[PDB]
Every structure is written in structure tokens, then in C-alpha cells.
Design a protein around this nucleic acid. Structure first.
Ligand code: MG
Ligand code: MG
Ligand code: MG
Lengths: 97, 126, 60, 156, 210, 116, 78
RNA sequence: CUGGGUUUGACAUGCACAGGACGCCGGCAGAGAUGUCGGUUCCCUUGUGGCCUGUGUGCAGGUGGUGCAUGGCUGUCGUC
RNA sequence: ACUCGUGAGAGACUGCCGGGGUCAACUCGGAGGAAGGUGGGGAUGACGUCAAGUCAUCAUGCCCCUUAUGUCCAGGGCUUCACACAUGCUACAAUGGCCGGUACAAAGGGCUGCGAUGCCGUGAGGUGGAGCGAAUCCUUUCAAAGCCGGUCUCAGUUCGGAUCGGGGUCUGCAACUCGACCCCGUGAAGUCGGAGUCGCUAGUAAUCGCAGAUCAGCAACGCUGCGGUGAAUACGUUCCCG
């Protein structure tokens, strides 16, 4: 499958990025896709703060990283350029699958 | 054309019930090539076994996600919904077996500090 | 741990044997974990502020 | 469920090639942590071997063996007034069938033969004939219940 | 004292805002470094002047600071002696300019951090901590668009040796409720005997803020 | 049968029967059979004298004899023990040579679990 | 992989020894030249400041310091 | 921990004595620190601002102790 | 017209009926319904005990060192060992091992990193570039358990893989003390385990692998998330502990 397995650092940031992508593509007037339900995961962060005997109150404090995906088909170079021209947030570390 | 939807833990399926000869053409694979366990065959036939319409109606499904059992359950739910929408009189014949509803049982959210979901770490007394 | 030493130790050093941490925030050559290249003080400051890439503390 | 009430029986559909809730329960019990198709093939081979050996209905032979090895009394242990008593209480059909299937699978895994299919076939044959480890354990449990029958007056 | 989690630290992305809202690839380190440097530089000054929040934002190689002063007049004195002085100090300590822009608060008693600063100053001024907390609670509950308050001054109260943590509350201060919009303030007071902790909670209202 | 000084099993495939030699095993025997043009599914009771001789000379030419390898291992061990290195010290003390855990593990090299 | 402390002198000595293929000990003077792959097990008599001990370098020894097989800082305690 | 260095110190800041060279790239003695040599010699502008170089000065520095003095964070009891 | 990863709305509020209950809360069954009686699962940790953990995250009152206990450098140590305790992996064999052919899952690590086709290699891999601040590229147009065929004939063995010797590889200047991985041989304990004891109530246990936190290079079998296939019990609180 395709589009996409990425990750972000802020739910607000990622949802704003999805919204602005939808807005710019709809303004270019190309199209939209059919969203599907899929949950997020819990990242792996259980780091200590001191090398001393901190083994009580030790494990972690989850770093909430909510991620959303938007699939797409039938490529068009115009949409390719409209989507690759710029990224407003730039904080969502997107990764290609 | 009539079309329904079936959902599972992490899988979805869309079918279009139409008359003809009984067959299951999956996304690029056939019935025996998609259900080799020989139990998912019986599971997805149960909706068509309670009411003998196995070789009477066609099944052109398109699924995505999950595994063998998940896809089997999704296709069963899709066939159940199609039978609900086509033949309302046969709806009890399918509800009596435990169909027409997606089993709420699904994968939960694993907990922190544990090995798996509902599994505490082993520790010996001292 | 000043600007001169930082610039001399970050780029190609004179001898390859000089491959110490040389943090960029405080500049101390040692007492810094190369796991993140930051001294514990600023490391935990950013951890508590929510800026460092993925470090936190007690919740269980 | 525990301390709340009974559990709802799973409305499982009868086996397609055998049509026996007891057979499906035996399959679910002998299932080895997900080996569904493997256990199904194993039980099918065992029933085919039992058929080739006897010359009758496999389902009927299995039902007869289960009815013959069904324990009619299972001992327990209850403390009444600061004293342990192994009072025997009336068992239910489902519990007796489950215990019989457990003993059968245990003695089949304990049997030393070539393959698991042959082990299960020979175990079923012995249970049907009346000379097997399952029948021996049933007789031992019956003897224990008859010996401990001296203390049965509570029915709490 | 207790294991209660910081409401601001918990709702930093739900209800409350972030003091450092920027992003940079490989430069976030230097960004937060300059941020904490400016914070340490302004610590004494803006603490003697009264400070509530210092929101720092990063732009194309420049900075955008917004400090919330409570008592304008001490930090903003003569034009070219205090404000410009601190500005030049920050500029020469950092590697860029500083277009400092101060923003005045609407009510010092409504901000948790300011209430904590005031109660800590009162305690350090050799006064009765009980009366100080009572008067602070009265000022913060004299209808400053509020609905609840909870003040706590832990540590060596009254210059004693026992860590007395007086739990004083008034109104409604729920911690498990998410739709609270509660402001929190954590302060560390320095005395001639040691350190003292000040934990404040101001439940303004039941505003959603979605 | 007699190949280089060791006897093969009675009823076993060639790739498993050739494992009895101190210098030939499953994959080594498979490669030898592939190079000599002999099948691997044959039992150990239908061998020919010509095949025995050809396999013997082929292994003697490519590899060396079982006794050769045995005494070579012995000579290398005693040499690395006499030079006086870390490997020699560990071999003398009965401890692992590759530098692994030695607190409680390494019983495979230290012998049975002795406590005194 | 930049230019390491290969001890160009020892490097060329080992190169000519490999070219002529004469198995003999090579009297060295450095202690930190075990990097370049051109050293085909050339037995170096190393100079630790006291004497020259003949020690042949091995595979796991590839990389380690020249004079580090035996403890160069002679000390036992008894 | 073993042994050689720097020791107003690797690294911040106020007060004095001389400076335009520290600062940059390589060579030599060493395991390197370190010492030394070769190419550049400041930017303002006469009041001196910045720089360090050598000598003083208050001090830096402590992952040294004291959580039976604390701030902050939080573990079992107890998600009862 | 099809699964509405972005926003909102509807749908569970005992909504209605009956047995009830004090015709007051509240309990069971039934109708519709995806969930019916806080829907399944979490975030959410009150006053306080353990004078609980932290002065090595940081500050911290007091004492102490200052040609030193501040700082760098080369080597060694934290990875040592005749033993014991704790947590995990490998298994102990036929629901098995090896070879050949085959299908779906969610989760991304990427800018001095990922790196597909090819050359040659038993194999780590030497050549390397189309493509990437984000679906043209590896993690495949996605794996293991799973299905078909051949073989081993139920044994210290084609189970198990450790020690050990020979032939090499990935990183960085430097891998016996100082990682991991590959090829050949070497083939030990282990025959499901006593006294004691641990975890599990439905997508739970079990079993299988995928991915990530930091590293140029790994001790990572660990810790976190993911899902593949997925069971039996639930007289009851006499009883061990809270
Ligand atoms: Mg101590
Ligand atoms: Mg104590
Ligand atoms: Mg055996």
C-alpha cells in the first residue's frame, strides 16, 4: 500500500498540515480522497533524568505523538508540484514508506 | 448496484452482491489461494450455509488490512449485510447464528510498564 | 569550552585521536553523554520544556 | 463472571464434515496456541484411522467413548469448621465432558506411539473398548469418590 | 509534597499555551540555549520588577520576546537607562539583536505566577505567612473573573526546621477535571535558612477554549 | 564403511553419514558430493569401491585428513598457549578465549558446576 | 576512512617485504600503526623502549596497538 | 586507578602593570598533553571599546559530603 | 453511488414496557440497536505512612579541597570470578528438523542517512547510482506462524546450539582485555525438571515476527508499540495474602 506511514510531533501541527494540504489542493481544484479510520500509537520514550539511584519514579512520561494519514491515487504533475512547492508547518517529520 | 461495507480490527471490505455462480474473486487471488487454512472457508460459508445460497449468488469482494481470519470475518459481515438488504425474510436465519453485527471484541490499547496487554511482569518473592 | 576550542574541536581536528564529545550548548569536553551531545543541565531543561527529541521522566 | 453469574455459551455452529458440538469442543481443547488447521487435520486423520480400524461411525464411536469415560462424581476439598473434607459433589454434564476431554488429550499426549494422529486414534479406540489410561483414571476417580462418600451432607 | 501533575505541563497542547513556539532543524538547540540565556539574564531584573510570563518566539535570524510585567515603572524607568540598558545587555550576551516589546497584564491578582511572586516576597519580608496567604487569597478572589483558588507555601515555614506545608484553599479547585482552564504557578523563594516552595492554583472559570 | 579411518552409520543418507569425519559435515559433504558428481539421497549400504577411492582422493587433495586436522588443532592450541598471550592464559586457566561472560557462565569450558 | 597514522616508513617496509616474500622479523620503532590493510601478518619486533620481543600479529590483533599483546607496563605485585 | 602536564587554572566576571598579537594552517621532540618553528598580523581611532597573551587580585572549579535541612519531580499502599 | 486518517452532527440518556423495589434510589428480562444498563481500553494518582528516591539534572543552608579531591593527556577498569540471587532468550523433540514452491496485517528509520536493477560472490558484502526535508527508493508491488511436495523413523539424533580451531565482512585511526555478522569443522549440558514460587477473565493467555528510543559500531535475547493465528474454566468466597 501507499500514502502513508509518517509521524509528527504535535497533534495540532499534523492536523493543521492536513487541513492546509486539503485547502491548497482544493484551491488548485484537483480532488480529495476517502478518509478511513485508523488510530495512533505510543512512541518509545522511557528515559531517565539522572544516572543516580532514580529507580523509583523511573519509567517514563508518554510523549503524545498523534499521526494522521491521507491516501491518494491517479498522479498528476500539477498536483505533485502544488504539494511539493512548500510545507507550512515543516515540523511534521514525514517519512516515505 | 447494491454495495455494503464490513469492518474488523484493522481491516475493511466492500462487496457487491449480484446473482450468478458462487465464487470469491479477491484482489488478485482466488478463493483457494486466499483461504488456505480450510477453516476460513467454512467461516465465510456459514452465512451461505444457514441459507443454502452458496452456488446461487456471486461475491466480488475488495478488502484491505488484517489477516486471514480478519478478512474472513469481514467478508462474512459483508455477506450478512447484503442478505439483510436483499432478502429481509432470511435475516433471522442469519441472526440466529451470531451474525449481522460486528463483534466488539478487538485489539485493545497496550498498557505501559507491562510486557503485553493484561500481563504483569514476573517477580519472585523476597 | 569557549568558542575557539569549540570551533577547533568540532571540525577536522589536528590529530584524529581527539574525538571527544565537545558539546555545543555548554562546550564542556567531558561530563556530556554522546547519546544526545548535550550536558545534563540543558538536556533536562529541554526534556521538561518539551523540546529535546524524546526524553522524559517518572510516570508509572 | 466470577462471583457475578454464569457465562453465555458460545453459539458455535456444528462441524461441517462431522456436525458434532463435542467434536468441535475437543478440537478447541486440543488446539495448540493457534494451530487451528493443524489440529483440525490431526483430528480428521485420527478419526479416519479409528474408522479404518473399527468400521463404524466415527462420531458415534467418539460419543460412546465419551459417555463411557464420563466421570459421574468428582471429588473436591472444602474447609468446614476448621477441618478439610474431600466431600464429593454432583458434577454437571458440561464439566464432566470437559474433564473427560482433558483426560483424553492428556493420555493421548502421554501415549508413546509413532505420530500424534496414531496416538489419538489408539487413545480413542482404547476409550471405546474400555481398556485405556482414561478409563483407568475414571475408575480411580470413582473409587476415590466412593471412599470419600462418607462426608456428603452439606450441599452448600 | 503530592504527586499531582502540573496542569500546565499536562495541557500544554490542549488548554494552555507554550512559552517557546518555534521549530528548527539542528538549530533548536541554539534556539533554546539563547532562550534560557535570556531567561537567566532577565531573572533578577524582572523578578524585582514583577514578572508573569516571558513568551519567546523565533523569526528569520531574529527574536521576538514578550514579557508580562505586573508593576510597570521599575523595569521601564528613564528611556535609555534601564530598558535600553537591559536590551543592550541581552544583545551583547547573545549573537543577534533584541526588539524587546513589553506587554502589560490586565490584573496581577488573576495571574498565578504573580500571586506566587507576591506571596514569596511577603514571606521573605519577615511577615506572617498565614496572613500573607490570606490577603493574597482575598485579593485573588475579590472578583477578578475567578471561581477558585488554592495557595500552598511548603518548605521551612517561619524559618523553622520542620517542612510545614500549609494547605490553604478557597472555592472550587478541581484537578481531575479537564475543562478547568486552571492557571498554575511554581516559585522557589530563597531565605537565610534554605529554600521554600510556592505552589498556586487559580481556577478562573469553566471555559472550554476549543 | 572405512573411508579415512572412521566408520559411517548403518542406514543414513550420505550428507549425514559423512559427518562422522572430523573435517566433514552436512554442508561440507553436500559440497563434496556436488563437486564429485554423486547424489546425496543414497544410503550408507550401496557404496562402491571406485566412489570410495575417488571421494578419498578428492578430500585428500582439497582438504586434509581428519587426523591432520586433529593434530593441527592441537598444535595451534599448544602454540598459542606457549607464546604467552591472552588466549594462552585463558586456555591455561580453563576460561573462555573470545572474551565473554565469566562471572557465572562459561561452565561449558570450566567443566561441571563445582562449588568450594 | 581518512589517512591514518600508518607510519609511512613501516608501511613501505612491509610493502617491500610482501613484494620480496621473505618470512623474517621486521624491526619496528612505532607502536600505533596497525591500520592499513597492506600488513599481511608481517611479524614486527616492536620497541617498547626496553628491548625487542618477537610477537606475531593475529586476526583479532588486527587493529590493536603493536606493543599490547603482553602487558607493556611490567607489573605483577608479587 | 597507573604516570606526564595546565594549574588565576579546560572554563565565566569586577579591579591593575605592556602589548599589538592572540586567534587561524602545517613541520620537529613525544603515547599525547605539552614546548618550539614557519605564512597573516586586528577591527575603532587617541579617549580608548572588543581580544587574549605573561604577572597580581578578589575567585572559577567540586560527578566531595550532608535528601535525619529543603525546592522541584514521583514509586508501593492504591485507581482502594 | 462505494471504508469519511479534517471538522461537525446523529447514535446510550434505564430512551420505553413488565417482574420488582417503600410504587424514592436501584436490580433482571424484553423491543429497536454496533455496542443497554460507568459499551471494550487508557490519560486522570486526595489528605498522608515508608524521616520514601534524588545535594551526580539543577538550585540548595553548613563543612571541607585550592599549587589540590579543578582540568587534559597515554594505558587499564566499570565487561575481572573457585560461587549465590533476579529477570529474559535457546531449547530438551515428530503439533518436530531440512530443502523447493506460495497470502494478507498496522506501525516508520531517512540530508553527510536510506539506498532498489546490475557486475561477482555459499555470505557478511568490494563497484555504485535512478529516487528522497518527504510515496517513484530498501523496511520489497510487505514478513513469520499459515498451505503443497520430498526426506529424516521417534534417537543425545538432520532437535538444541554454546566453548574451541581455520577462511572473512560493517563502523570508525585504533574491536583478545575492545560489538555485531558470515562460511567450514569441532557437537558439551538439556530426555519438560524436586522443596518453593510467578503471570493470565476475551481478542486475555499462548504463540510469531515487524518497528523504534540512542550509536559512524553494536552487548538489545532487554524496554516500549503493532498486529498474524488465536484456546479451556468461571460450584463459590469455607479458604492463603491485601
Ligand atoms: Mg553518598
Ligand atoms: Mg534515609
Ligand atoms: Mg529420546
Amino acid at each position: 500500500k501507499i500514502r502513508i506511514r509518517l509521524k509528527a510531533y504535535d497533534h495540532e501541527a499534523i492536523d493543521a498540515s492536513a487541513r492546509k494540504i486539503v485547502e491548497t489542493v482544493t484551491r488548485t481544484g484537483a480532488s480529495v480522497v476517502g478518509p478511513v479510520p485508523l488510530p495512533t500509537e505510543k512512541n518509545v520514550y522511557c528515559v531517565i533524568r539522572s544516572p543516580h539511584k532514580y529507580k523509583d519514579s523511573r519509567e517514563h512520561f508518554e510523549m503524545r505523538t498523534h499521526k494522521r494519514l491521507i491516501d491518494i491515487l491517479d498522479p498528476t504533475p500539477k498536483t505533485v508540484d502544488a504539494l511539493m512547492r512548500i510545507d507550512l508547518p515543516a515540523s511534521v517529520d514525514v517519512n516515505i514508506q | 448496484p447494491i454495495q455494503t461495507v464490513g469492518r474488523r480490527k484493522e481491516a475493511v471490505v466492500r462487496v457487491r452482491l449480484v446473482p450468478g455462480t458462487g465464487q470469491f474473486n479477491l484482489d488478485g487471488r482466488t478463493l483457494e489461494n486466499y483461504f488456505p487454512n480450510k477453516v476460513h472457508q467454512q467461516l465465510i460459508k456459514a452465512p451461505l450455509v444457514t441459507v443454502d445460497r452458496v452456488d446461487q449468488f456471486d461475491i466480488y469482494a475488495h478488502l484491505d488490512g488484517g489477516g486471514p481470519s480478519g478478512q474472513a470475518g469481514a467478508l462474512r459481515l459483508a455477506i450478512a449485510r447484503a442478505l439483510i438488504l436483499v432478502q429481509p425474510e432470511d435475516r433471522p436465519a442469519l441472526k440466529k447464528a451470531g451474525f449481522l453485527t460486528r463483534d466488539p471484541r478487538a485489539i485493545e490499547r497496550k498498557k505501559y510498564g507491562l510486557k503485553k496487554a493484561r500481563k504483569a511482569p514476573q517477580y519472585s518473592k523476597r | 569550552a569557549k568558542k575557539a576550542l569549540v570551533h577547533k574541536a568540532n571540525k577536522k581536528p589536528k590529530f584524529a585521536v581527539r574525538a571527544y564529545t565537545r558539546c555545543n550548548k555548554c562546550g564542556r569536553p567531558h561530563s556530556v553523554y554522546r547519546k544526545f551531545g548535550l550536558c545534563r543541565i540543558c538536556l533536562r531543561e529541554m526534556a521538561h520544556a518539551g523540546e529535546l527529541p524524546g526524553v522524559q521522566k517518572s510516570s508509572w | 463472571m466470577p462471583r457475578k453469574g454464569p457465562a453465555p455459551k458460545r453459539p458455535l455452529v456444528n462441524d461441517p464434515v462431522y456436525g458434532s458440538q463435542l467434536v468441535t469442543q475437543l478440537v478447541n481443547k486440543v488446539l495448540l496456541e493457534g494451530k487451528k488447521s493443524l489440529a483440525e487435520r490431526i483430528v480428521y486423520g485420527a478419526l479416519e484411522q479409528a474408522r479404518e480400524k473399527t468400521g463404524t461411525d466415527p462420531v458415534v464411536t467418539l460419543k460412546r467413548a465419551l459417555d463411557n469415560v464420563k466421570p459421574a462424581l468428582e471429588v473436591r476439598s472444602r474447609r468446614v469448621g476448621g477441618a478439610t473434607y474431600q466431600v464429593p459433589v454432583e458434577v454437571r454434564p458440561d464439566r464432566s465432558t470437559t474433564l473427560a476431554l482433558r483426560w483424553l488429550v492428556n493420555f493421548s499426549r502421554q501415549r508413546r506411539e509413532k505420530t500424534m494422529v496414531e496416538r489419538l486414534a489408539n487413545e480413542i479406540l482404547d476409550a471405546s473398548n474400555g481398556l485405556g489410561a482414561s478409563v483407568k483414571r475414571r475408575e480411580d476417580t470413582h473409587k476415590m469418590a466412593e471412599a470419600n462418600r462418607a462426608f456428603a451432607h452439606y450441599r452448600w | 509534597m503530592g504527586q499531582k501533575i502540573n496542569p500546565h505541563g499536562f495541557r500544554l497542547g490542549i488548554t494552555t499555551e507554550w512559552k517557546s513556539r518555534w521549530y528548527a532543524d539542528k538549530q533548536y538547540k541554539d534556539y533554546v540555549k539563547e532562550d534560557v540565556a535570556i531567561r537567566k539574564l532577565l531573572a533578577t531584573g524582572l523578578e524585582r520588577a514583577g514578572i508573569a510570563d516571558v513568551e519567546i518566539e523565533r523569526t528569520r535570524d531574529r527574536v521576538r520576546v514578550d514579557i508580562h510585567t505586573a508593576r510597570p515603572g521599575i523595569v521601564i524607568g528613564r528611556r535609555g537607562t534601564e530598558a535600553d540598558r537591559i536590551r543592550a545587555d541581552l544583545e551583547k550576551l547573545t549573537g543577534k539583536q533584541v526588539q524587546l516589546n513589553i506587554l502589560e497584564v490586565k490584573n496581577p491578582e488573576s495571574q498565578a505566577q504573580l500571586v506566587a511572586q507576591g506571596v514569596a516576597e511577603q514571606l521573605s519580608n519577615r511577615v506572617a505567612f498565614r496572613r500573607a496567604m490570606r490577603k493574597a487569597i482575598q485579593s485573588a478572589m475579590r472578583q477578578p473573573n475567578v471561581k477558585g483558588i488554592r495557595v500552598q507555601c511548603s518548605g521551612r515555614l517561619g524559618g523553622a526546621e520542620m517542612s510545614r506545608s500549609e494547605f490553604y484553599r478557597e472555592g472550587r479547585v478541581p484537578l481531575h477535571t479537564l475543562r478547568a482552564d486552571i492557571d498554575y504557578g511554581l516559585y522557589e523563594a530563597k531565605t537565610t535558612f534554605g529554600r521554600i516552595g510556592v505552589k498556586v492554583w487559580i481556577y478562573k472559570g469553566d471555559i472550554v477554549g476549543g | 564403511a572405512r573411508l579415512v579411518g572412521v566408520d559411517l552409520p548403518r542406514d543414513k543418507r550420505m550428507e549425514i553419514a559423512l559427518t562422522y569425519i572430523y573435517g566433514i559435515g552436512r554442508t561440507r559433504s553436500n559440497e563434496i558430493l556436488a563437486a564429485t558428481g554423486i547424489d546425496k539421497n543414497m544410503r550408507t549400504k550401496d557404496l562402491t569401491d571406485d566412489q570410495v577411492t575417488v571421494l578419498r582422493d578428492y578430500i585428500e587433495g582439497n582438504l586434509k585428513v581428519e587426523g591432520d586436522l586433529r593434530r593441527e588443532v592441537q598444535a595451534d592450541i599448544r602454540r598459542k598457549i606457549e607464546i604467552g598471550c591472552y588466549q594462552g592464559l585463558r586456555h591455561r586457566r580453563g576460561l573462555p578465549v573470545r572474551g565473554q561472560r565469566t562471572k557465572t557462565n562459561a561452565r561449558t569450558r570450566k567443566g561441571p558446576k563445582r562449588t568450594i | 576512512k581518512k589517512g591514518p597514522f600508518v607510519d609511512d616508513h613501516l608501511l613501505k617496509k612491509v610493502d617491500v617485504q610482501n613484494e620480496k616474500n621473505t618470512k623474517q622479523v621486521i624491526k619496528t620503532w612505532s607502536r600505533r600503526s596497525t591500520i592499513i590493510p597492506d600488513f599481511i601478518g608481517h611479524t614486527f619486533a616492536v620497541h617498547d623502549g626496553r628491548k625487542h620481543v618477537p610477537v606475531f600479529v593475529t586476526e583479532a590483533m588486527v587493529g590493536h596497538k603493536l606493543g599490547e599483546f603482553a602487558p607493556t607496563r611490567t607489573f605483577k605485585g608479587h
